[PDB]
Design a binder for this molecule. Sequence first.
Ligand code: BEF
Ligand code: BEF
Ligand code: MG
Ligand code: MG
Lengths: 120, 119
Amino acid sequence: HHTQILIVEDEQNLARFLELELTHENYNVDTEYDGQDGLDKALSHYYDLIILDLMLPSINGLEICRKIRQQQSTPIIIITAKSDTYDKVAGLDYGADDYIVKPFDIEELLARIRAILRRQ
Amino acid sequence: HTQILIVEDEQNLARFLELELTHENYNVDTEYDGQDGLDKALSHYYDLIILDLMLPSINGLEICRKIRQQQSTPIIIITAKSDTYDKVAGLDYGADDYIVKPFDIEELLARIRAILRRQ
Ligand code: BEF
Ligand code: BEF
Ligand SMILES: [Mg+2]
Ligand SMILES: [Mg+2]
């Protein structure tokens, strides 16, 4: 019984870093670097929480978020270099549970994962 | 739904949030002192509590711990403390979100909506 996380992120250094840091916290992690592959994975497997970058190949994160939310209430955290207030609001209103501006400290992401999953 | 408590000692900010939130059809109570805020939270029902960290009498992290000891009530921390250690502590002590000042009201309102989806 492991908590399952999907990361959709096209910057492969950060993607691997997040995978390693989350695996160290005893999460099971799947990663996708392409937006369509990430959506397809999110819809075909059960995750406990999904981490979504916004600028991705094929389709971008807000479309992924919308299409996941047509099917699932699965927690979503958006991570992105997009830091304007409107981008944050739009992402939360499309159903993301949190929204973190890059670059961030891993310990903050881990704390926010814990806080969201506490209420599941 | 509608009941919000704000514990914030910077009164210009508190009245702003109070008015903006009331404009959004929330019923807002506010307290400028940390002990009064904690007392209010434990004595009265709220749907969501907004906690500053740096307050007179008792600091917001301790308020958060004591509330979460007794209630499931959603908590958003708002604070000028931007350090990662403080974010991690606030979230681990029971806060559902943590916003660094300054922030735009539409962000707060969106995070309130998102947190109330979690119940
Ligand atoms: F490409 Be992600 F929005 F940083
Ligand atoms: F006084 Be609060 F922590 F900004
Ligand atoms: Mg990207
Ligand atoms: Mg203060």
